[PDB]
Tab-separated table of C-alpha atoms and ligand atoms in Angstrom:
chain	number	residue	atom	x	y	z
A	1	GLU	CA	42.876	26.881	-9.063
A	2	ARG	CA	44.955	24.397	-11.270
A	3	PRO	CA	44.792	20.612	-11.118
A	4	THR	CA	47.355	17.867	-10.779
A	5	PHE	CA	48.753	16.348	-13.833
A	6	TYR	CA	50.648	12.817	-14.069
A	7	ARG	CA	52.932	11.610	-16.855
A	8	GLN	CA	52.636	8.346	-19.057
A	9	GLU	CA	54.577	7.527	-22.316
A	10	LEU	CA	51.800	6.537	-24.645
A	11	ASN	CA	53.196	5.311	-28.011
A	12	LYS	CA	56.619	7.128	-28.336
A	13	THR	CA	55.073	10.406	-26.828
A	14	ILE	CA	54.718	11.723	-23.202
A	15	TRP	CA	51.166	12.697	-22.258
A	16	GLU	CA	51.018	15.065	-18.956
A	17	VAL	CA	47.167	15.283	-18.297
A	18	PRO	CA	44.917	16.194	-15.238
A	19	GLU	CA	44.059	13.344	-12.815
A	20	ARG	CA	40.449	13.392	-13.993
A	21	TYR	CA	41.214	11.868	-17.507
A	22	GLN	CA	41.580	8.398	-16.882
A	23	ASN	CA	42.211	5.029	-18.981
A	24	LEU	CA	43.684	6.743	-22.041
A	25	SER	CA	43.989	4.439	-24.987
A	26	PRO	CA	45.723	5.010	-28.204
A	27	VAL	CA	43.934	5.976	-31.434
A	28	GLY	CA	46.108	8.033	-33.573
A	29	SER	CA	48.267	12.132	-31.804
A	30	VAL	CA	44.815	11.368	-30.279
A	31	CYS	CA	43.572	9.192	-27.143
A	32	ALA	CA	40.155	7.833	-25.940
A	33	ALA	CA	39.729	8.792	-22.473
A	34	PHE	CA	37.271	9.024	-19.537
A	35	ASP	CA	36.682	12.385	-17.841
A	36	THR	CA	35.537	11.475	-14.167
A	37	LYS	CA	34.629	15.073	-13.547
A	38	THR	CA	31.604	15.339	-15.964
A	39	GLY	CA	31.308	11.346	-16.786
A	40	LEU	CA	31.947	11.652	-20.382
A	41	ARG	CA	34.153	9.375	-22.495
A	42	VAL	CA	36.239	11.762	-24.546
A	43	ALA	CA	38.837	12.170	-27.110
A	44	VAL	CA	42.078	14.245	-26.334
A	45	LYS	CA	44.565	15.394	-28.841
A	46	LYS	CA	48.158	16.608	-28.117
A	47	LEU	CA	49.652	19.287	-30.954
A	48	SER	CA	53.082	17.836	-31.951
A	49	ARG	CA	55.557	20.740	-31.579
A	50	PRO	CA	52.898	23.286	-31.575
A	51	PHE	CA	55.170	26.198	-32.279
A	52	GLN	CA	57.996	24.638	-34.442
A	53	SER	CA	57.713	27.676	-37.101
A	54	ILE	CA	55.718	30.599	-37.836
A	55	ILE	CA	53.448	28.755	-40.290
A	56	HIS	CA	52.789	26.148	-37.344
A	57	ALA	CA	52.347	28.753	-34.540
A	58	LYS	CA	49.556	30.530	-36.561
A	59	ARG	CA	48.111	26.838	-37.451
A	60	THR	CA	47.953	25.933	-33.583
A	61	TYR	CA	46.330	29.323	-32.995
A	62	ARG	CA	43.933	28.721	-35.916
A	63	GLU	CA	42.976	25.655	-34.723
A	64	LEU	CA	42.371	26.287	-31.160
A	65	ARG	CA	40.493	29.736	-31.951
A	66	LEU	CA	38.247	27.817	-34.221
A	67	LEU	CA	37.788	24.700	-31.559
A	68	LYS	CA	37.006	27.632	-29.045
A	69	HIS	CA	34.281	29.482	-31.185
A	70	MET	CA	32.549	26.043	-32.260
A	71	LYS	CA	29.383	25.381	-30.165
A	72	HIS	CA	26.742	23.105	-31.775
A	73	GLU	CA	25.355	19.731	-31.588
A	74	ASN	CA	26.737	18.811	-34.943
A	75	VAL	CA	30.222	20.327	-34.795
A	76	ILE	CA	33.503	19.387	-32.848
A	77	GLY	CA	33.575	21.267	-29.715
A	78	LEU	CA	36.031	21.945	-26.769
A	79	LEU	CA	34.935	20.576	-23.418
A	80	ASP	CA	38.529	21.413	-22.338
A	81	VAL	CA	41.946	22.688	-23.497
A	82	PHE	CA	44.968	22.624	-21.272
A	83	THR	CA	48.738	22.887	-20.847
A	84	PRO	CA	50.760	21.197	-18.175
A	85	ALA	CA	53.092	24.487	-18.332
A	86	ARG	CA	52.801	27.204	-15.369
A	87	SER	CA	53.951	30.066	-17.738
A	88	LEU	CA	54.531	31.393	-21.164
A	89	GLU	CA	58.140	30.945	-20.451
A	90	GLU	CA	57.849	27.324	-20.529
A	91	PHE	CA	54.471	26.890	-22.431
A	92	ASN	CA	54.949	24.390	-25.114
A	93	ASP	CA	52.116	21.820	-25.123
A	94	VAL	CA	48.375	22.281	-26.286
A	95	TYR	CA	45.945	19.405	-25.168
A	96	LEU	CA	42.631	19.515	-26.805
A	97	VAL	CA	39.683	17.608	-25.615
A	98	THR	CA	36.511	16.544	-27.076
A	99	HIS	CA	33.384	14.158	-27.114
A	100	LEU	CA	34.305	10.910	-27.987
A	101	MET	CA	32.406	9.464	-31.037
A	102	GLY	CA	34.392	6.623	-31.983
A	103	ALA	CA	34.191	6.231	-35.777
A	104	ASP	CA	33.416	8.200	-38.848
A	105	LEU	CA	31.344	7.667	-42.060
A	106	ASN	CA	33.890	5.644	-43.860
A	107	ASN	CA	34.158	3.189	-40.569
A	108	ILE	CA	30.145	2.809	-41.059
A	109	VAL	CA	28.866	3.449	-44.346
A	110	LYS	CA	31.598	1.842	-46.962
A	111	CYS	CA	30.272	0.554	-49.978
A	112	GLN	CA	26.810	0.350	-48.348
A	113	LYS	CA	23.672	1.568	-49.908
A	114	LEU	CA	21.725	3.024	-46.560
A	115	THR	CA	18.111	3.467	-46.024
A	116	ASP	CA	16.593	6.613	-47.095
A	117	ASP	CA	15.682	7.332	-43.391
A	118	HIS	CA	19.324	7.149	-42.586
A	119	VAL	CA	20.566	9.122	-45.227
A	120	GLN	CA	18.258	11.817	-44.338
A	121	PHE	CA	19.454	11.796	-40.694
A	122	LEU	CA	23.107	12.063	-41.610
A	123	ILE	CA	22.564	15.163	-44.203
A	124	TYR	CA	20.245	16.712	-42.108
A	125	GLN	CA	22.894	16.783	-39.311
A	126	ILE	CA	25.722	18.027	-41.590
A	127	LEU	CA	23.510	20.937	-43.170
A	128	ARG	CA	22.430	21.971	-39.429
A	129	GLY	CA	26.258	21.932	-38.555
A	130	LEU	CA	26.776	23.766	-41.804
A	131	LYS	CA	24.256	26.366	-41.324
A	132	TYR	CA	25.963	27.063	-37.991
A	133	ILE	CA	29.338	27.143	-39.518
A	134	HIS	CA	28.475	28.970	-42.549
A	135	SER	CA	26.865	31.887	-40.489
A	136	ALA	CA	30.017	32.647	-38.698
A	137	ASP	CA	31.531	33.103	-42.026
A	138	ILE	CA	33.692	30.131	-41.717
A	139	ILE	CA	34.309	27.627	-44.499
A	140	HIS	CA	35.429	24.008	-43.925
A	141	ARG	CA	37.012	23.472	-47.545
A	142	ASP	CA	37.603	19.728	-47.036
A	143	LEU	CA	34.411	17.929	-46.361
A	144	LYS	CA	34.259	14.350	-46.795
A	145	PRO	CA	33.254	11.078	-44.828
A	146	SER	CA	36.388	10.845	-42.998
A	147	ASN	CA	35.902	14.415	-41.297
A	148	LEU	CA	32.311	13.388	-39.967
A	149	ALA	CA	32.484	11.628	-36.658
A	150	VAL	CA	29.443	9.265	-35.967
A	151	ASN	CA	28.638	7.440	-32.884
A	152	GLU	CA	26.645	4.203	-32.731
A	153	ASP	CA	23.516	6.436	-32.346
A	154	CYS	CA	23.606	8.059	-35.955
A	155	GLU	CA	24.823	11.407	-34.119
A	156	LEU	CA	26.954	13.332	-36.569
A	157	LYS	CA	29.862	15.938	-35.456
A	158	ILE	CA	31.662	17.907	-38.198
A	159	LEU	CA	35.353	17.597	-37.671
A	160	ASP	CA	38.657	18.681	-39.058
A	161	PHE	CA	38.523	22.041	-41.304
A	162	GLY	CA	40.836	22.547	-43.857
A	163	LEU	CA	43.721	24.487	-41.676
A	164	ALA	CA	46.359	23.980	-43.850
A	165	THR	CA	49.686	19.158	-49.932
A	166	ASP	CA	50.264	18.409	-53.799
A	167	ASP	CA	51.007	14.690	-53.356
A	168	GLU	CA	48.300	14.042	-50.733
A	169	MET	CA	45.693	15.282	-53.517
A	170	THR	CA	47.129	13.432	-56.434
A	171	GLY	CA	45.509	10.228	-58.177
A	172	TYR	CA	43.041	7.608	-57.261
A	173	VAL	CA	42.456	9.426	-53.522
A	174	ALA	CA	39.285	10.377	-51.441
A	175	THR	CA	41.298	13.325	-50.554
A	176	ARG	CA	39.899	14.853	-53.675
A	177	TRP	CA	36.789	13.329	-54.591
A	178	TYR	CA	34.592	15.599	-52.689
A	179	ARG	CA	36.168	18.936	-53.597
A	180	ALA	CA	34.180	21.363	-55.800
A	181	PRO	CA	35.945	21.749	-58.861
A	182	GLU	CA	35.973	25.625	-58.555
A	183	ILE	CA	39.021	24.778	-56.061
A	184	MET	CA	40.084	21.441	-57.003
A	185	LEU	CA	41.548	23.443	-60.214
A	186	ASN	CA	41.849	26.889	-58.486
A	187	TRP	CA	39.160	28.829	-60.570
A	188	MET	CA	38.537	31.580	-58.588
A	189	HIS	CA	38.424	32.800	-54.938
A	190	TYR	CA	35.695	30.717	-53.623
A	191	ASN	CA	32.323	31.050	-51.768
A	192	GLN	CA	31.552	28.838	-48.824
A	193	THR	CA	29.203	26.831	-50.976
A	194	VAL	CA	32.176	24.705	-51.871
A	195	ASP	CA	30.946	22.756	-48.790
A	196	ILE	CA	27.226	22.102	-50.240
A	197	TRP	CA	29.226	20.735	-53.147
A	198	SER	CA	31.043	18.358	-50.969
A	199	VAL	CA	27.799	17.484	-48.984
A	200	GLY	CA	26.249	16.524	-52.545
A	201	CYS	CA	28.946	13.913	-53.247
A	202	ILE	CA	28.626	12.535	-49.781
A	203	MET	CA	24.786	12.185	-50.268
A	204	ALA	CA	25.162	10.440	-53.637
A	205	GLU	CA	27.432	8.257	-52.027
A	206	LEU	CA	25.404	7.200	-49.033
A	207	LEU	CA	22.565	6.191	-51.377
A	208	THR	CA	24.306	4.940	-54.365
A	209	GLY	CA	26.832	3.139	-51.962
A	210	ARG	CA	29.587	4.288	-54.561
A	211	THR	CA	32.024	7.110	-54.951
A	212	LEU	CA	30.160	9.956	-56.838
A	213	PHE	CA	33.081	11.243	-58.762
A	214	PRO	CA	36.164	8.871	-58.383
A	215	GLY	CA	38.640	10.513	-60.712
A	216	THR	CA	42.047	8.677	-61.243
A	217	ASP	CA	43.238	12.354	-61.257
A	218	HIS	CA	42.309	16.198	-61.096
A	219	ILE	CA	41.307	16.070	-65.141
A	220	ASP	CA	39.590	12.755	-65.186
A	221	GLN	CA	37.497	14.100	-62.152
A	222	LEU	CA	36.710	17.171	-63.742
A	223	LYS	CA	35.558	15.087	-66.791
A	224	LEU	CA	33.482	12.645	-64.621
A	225	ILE	CA	31.946	15.780	-62.886
A	226	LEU	CA	31.177	17.959	-66.430
A	227	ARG	CA	29.657	14.840	-67.679
A	228	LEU	CA	27.081	14.590	-64.889
A	229	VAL	CA	26.435	18.331	-64.341
A	230	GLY	CA	27.024	19.707	-67.933
A	231	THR	CA	29.756	22.060	-69.230
A	232	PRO	CA	29.791	25.418	-68.003
A	233	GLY	CA	27.989	27.967	-69.961
A	234	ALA	CA	29.331	31.496	-70.907
A	235	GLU	CA	28.191	33.124	-67.673
A	236	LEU	CA	29.835	30.899	-65.571
A	237	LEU	CA	33.103	31.252	-67.914
A	238	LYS	CA	33.376	35.007	-67.267
A	239	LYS	CA	33.442	34.112	-63.400
A	240	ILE	CA	36.417	31.544	-63.916
A	241	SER	CA	39.160	34.479	-63.098
A	242	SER	CA	42.151	32.422	-64.417
A	243	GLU	CA	42.694	32.719	-68.240
A	244	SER	CA	44.326	29.159	-68.244
A	245	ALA	CA	41.449	27.382	-66.497
A	246	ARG	CA	38.924	29.155	-68.861
A	247	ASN	CA	40.937	28.366	-71.956
A	248	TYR	CA	41.233	24.774	-70.894
A	249	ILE	CA	37.498	24.553	-70.056
A	250	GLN	CA	36.723	26.354	-73.476
A	251	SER	CA	38.681	23.389	-75.197
A	252	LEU	CA	36.410	21.063	-73.628
A	253	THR	CA	33.676	19.662	-76.117
A	254	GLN	CA	30.320	20.975	-74.841
A	255	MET	CA	27.987	18.811	-73.284
A	256	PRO	CA	24.629	18.905	-71.365
A	257	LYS	CA	23.229	18.291	-67.826
A	258	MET	CA	22.513	14.476	-67.647
A	259	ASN	CA	19.011	13.589	-66.115
A	260	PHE	CA	19.782	12.677	-62.143
A	261	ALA	CA	16.486	10.564	-62.035
A	262	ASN	CA	18.196	8.176	-64.246
A	263	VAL	CA	21.682	8.441	-62.619
A	264	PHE	CA	20.039	7.573	-59.305
A	265	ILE	CA	17.540	5.100	-60.288
A	266	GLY	CA	14.944	3.969	-57.590
A	267	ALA	CA	16.188	7.100	-55.485
A	268	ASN	CA	13.446	9.294	-53.570
A	269	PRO	CA	12.708	11.978	-55.827
A	270	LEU	CA	13.059	14.650	-52.956
A	271	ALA	CA	16.448	13.665	-52.655
A	272	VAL	CA	17.107	13.471	-56.303
A	273	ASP	CA	15.870	16.831	-56.507
A	274	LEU	CA	18.191	18.018	-53.690
A	275	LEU	CA	20.992	16.505	-55.277
A	276	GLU	CA	20.170	18.547	-58.336
A	277	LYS	CA	20.208	21.719	-56.529
A	278	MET	CA	23.576	20.813	-54.527
A	279	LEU	CA	25.617	19.664	-57.518
A	280	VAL	CA	25.889	22.682	-59.601
A	281	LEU	CA	28.659	23.837	-61.262
A	282	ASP	CA	27.975	27.706	-60.759
A	283	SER	CA	28.777	28.040	-56.946
A	284	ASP	CA	26.536	31.133	-56.974
A	285	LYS	CA	23.482	29.205	-57.825
A	286	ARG	CA	23.931	26.156	-55.433
A	287	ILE	CA	21.602	25.626	-52.457
A	288	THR	CA	22.572	26.940	-49.269
A	289	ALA	CA	22.782	25.007	-45.898
A	290	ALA	CA	19.916	27.167	-44.525
A	291	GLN	CA	17.655	26.891	-47.520
A	292	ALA	CA	18.262	23.018	-47.714
A	293	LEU	CA	17.299	22.310	-44.124
A	294	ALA	CA	13.677	23.950	-45.382
A	295	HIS	CA	13.663	21.207	-48.139
A	296	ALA	CA	10.810	18.819	-48.275
A	297	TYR	CA	13.204	15.790	-47.983
A	298	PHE	CA	14.000	16.569	-44.273
A	299	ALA	CA	10.337	17.481	-43.618
A	300	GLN	CA	10.540	14.574	-40.911
A	301	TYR	CA	13.609	16.219	-39.260
A	302	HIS	CA	12.972	19.962	-39.886
A	303	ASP	CA	12.788	22.329	-36.972
A	304	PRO	CA	13.429	25.862	-37.600
A	305	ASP	CA	13.592	26.880	-33.920
A	306	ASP	CA	16.132	24.195	-33.318
A	307	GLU	CA	18.652	25.167	-36.299
A	308	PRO	CA	20.707	27.450	-34.419
A	309	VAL	CA	23.101	30.302	-36.139
A	310	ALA	CA	26.496	31.252	-34.354
A	311	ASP	CA	27.898	34.123	-32.681
A	312	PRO	CA	30.278	36.110	-35.404
A	313	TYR	CA	33.947	34.864	-35.642
A	314	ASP	CA	36.665	37.475	-35.956
A	315	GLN	CA	39.070	35.853	-38.311
A	316	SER	CA	41.004	39.143	-39.150
A	317	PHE	CA	44.139	37.454	-37.736
A	318	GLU	CA	44.296	35.533	-40.772
A	319	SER	CA	45.699	38.504	-42.596
A	320	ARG	CA	48.179	39.308	-40.391
A	321	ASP	CA	52.033	38.641	-39.986
A	322	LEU	CA	53.555	37.837	-36.859
A	323	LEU	CA	56.479	36.046	-35.320
A	324	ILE	CA	56.575	32.922	-33.373
A	325	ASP	CA	56.521	34.212	-29.915
A	326	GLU	CA	53.477	36.624	-30.674
A	327	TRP	CA	51.402	33.589	-31.941
A	328	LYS	CA	52.258	31.647	-29.010
A	329	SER	CA	51.301	34.367	-26.788
A	330	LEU	CA	48.228	34.789	-28.513
A	331	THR	CA	47.830	30.909	-28.232
A	332	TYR	CA	48.500	31.129	-24.480
A	333	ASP	CA	45.968	33.816	-23.757
A	334	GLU	CA	43.808	31.444	-25.669
A	335	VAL	CA	44.477	28.518	-23.488
A	336	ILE	CA	44.345	30.056	-20.019
A	337	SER	CA	41.399	32.162	-20.686
A	338	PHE	CA	39.413	29.091	-21.567
A	339	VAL	CA	35.889	28.270	-19.993
A	340	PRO	CA	34.118	25.117	-19.979
A	341	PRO	CA	30.560	24.531	-20.815
A	342	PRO	CA	27.574	23.370	-18.740
B	401	MIH	O1	35.557	10.611	-31.782
B	401	MIH	N1	36.435	11.329	-32.124
B	401	MIH	C1	36.384	12.335	-31.529
B	401	MIH	C2	37.678	13.414	-31.703
B	401	MIH	C3	38.466	13.361	-32.875
B	401	MIH	C4	39.405	14.127	-33.223
B	401	MIH	C5	39.710	15.279	-32.471
B	401	MIH	C6	39.434	16.771	-33.045
B	401	MIH	C7	39.738	17.837	-32.420
B	401	MIH	C8	39.968	17.714	-31.039
B	401	MIH	F1	40.124	19.026	-30.386
B	401	MIH	C9	40.308	16.559	-30.248
B	401	MIH	C10	40.035	15.560	-31.345
B	401	MIH	F2	40.192	14.288	-30.401
B	401	MIH	C11	40.462	13.781	-33.902
B	401	MIH	C12	40.397	12.616	-34.719
B	401	MIH	C13	41.316	12.144	-35.911
B	401	MIH	C14	41.289	10.439	-35.931
B	401	MIH	C15	42.201	10.265	-37.318
B	401	MIH	N2	41.581	10.607	-38.565
B	401	MIH	C16	41.501	12.553	-38.212
B	401	MIH	C17	40.700	12.699	-36.957
B	401	MIH	N3	39.196	11.671	-34.369
B	401	MIH	C18	38.519	11.946	-33.398
B	401	MIH	C19	37.363	10.960	-33.178
B	401	MIH	C20	37.465	9.786	-33.680
B	401	MIH	C21	36.942	9.385	-35.239
B	401	MIH	CL1	36.210	10.834	-35.799
B	401	MIH	C22	37.157	8.345	-35.731
B	401	MIH	C23	37.440	7.243	-34.818
B	401	MIH	C24	38.042	7.286	-33.547
B	401	MIH	C25	38.071	8.617	-32.937
B	401	MIH	CL2	38.477	9.004	-31.294
């Protein structure tokens, strides 16, 4: 087998790709391109210094393994992964190819009170993708509009899992406005429902057209949050397994859950109901992706025979220490073993 690769310097970096891919244009390192073999326009990603270190060697493996496992209409998939190397001895580049989408929610919603029919179609897709993700016991951890690719047909694909800092999460920034508090403030080892909280921020935003919890810092955000959803009761308190977090919450002057119908004025009661059930402090009691696809709000889009689960994902590599070379070989095995879809 083996196709023929060709060079082109593209904004500071050399990309060497199979002939099939043509008309590469910059974007971010990512490129738009056109895949002659299949007729699909696609996004292409080159991992910078994929095996620079142990943290990085593991990271590339984690990413490639994740992209390799994901097969679903609402989750970022791999049409192709390749290296121009001819052996492990000079293997040093990974190019990850996916469908081209073209924008994300930010570049389409953005201070923009959408129609109820839209907001349903967007969240249904998130949740369908999330039912599939959560079914392989994978968590995303960092859901937010920028990690949701939308094409001009309102078709959503979930992107960029939380594979990996303190400065990138500080002050008035969207890097932190969608995070469940239990993880913003490291309260406990956290379930997968952390994602459902993020969907609830996103949803509120799409209807209201304004950031739900746009806190100026971690503690201002917690304050904005508790105000909307109540301060925690003694039951949740026991679960927060971090004496300093508990103590601080205990300091907070108690207050009750606000009425959402009055926060989301003129919003469809079904949506308000859903939000009520997503934005819950006790991660244990939130609605799941599965259960939410069965909610009335998505009755026009719910199809329990077209809401696939996944195969199981063996992530036991995570709790496993290895050398650069051993991660890179595990990575190489993954690249050369790849099979494309129909
Ligand atoms: O459609 N599309 C498809 C895939 C991506 C990817 C992307 C993710 C995994 C992969 F193996 C290959 C990729 F190209 C990474 C980014 C990165 C772009 C900058 N921000 C982080 C993700 N953007 C896109 C996009 C995209 C988006 Cl979501 C908005 C605008 C333009 C593009 Cl081409």
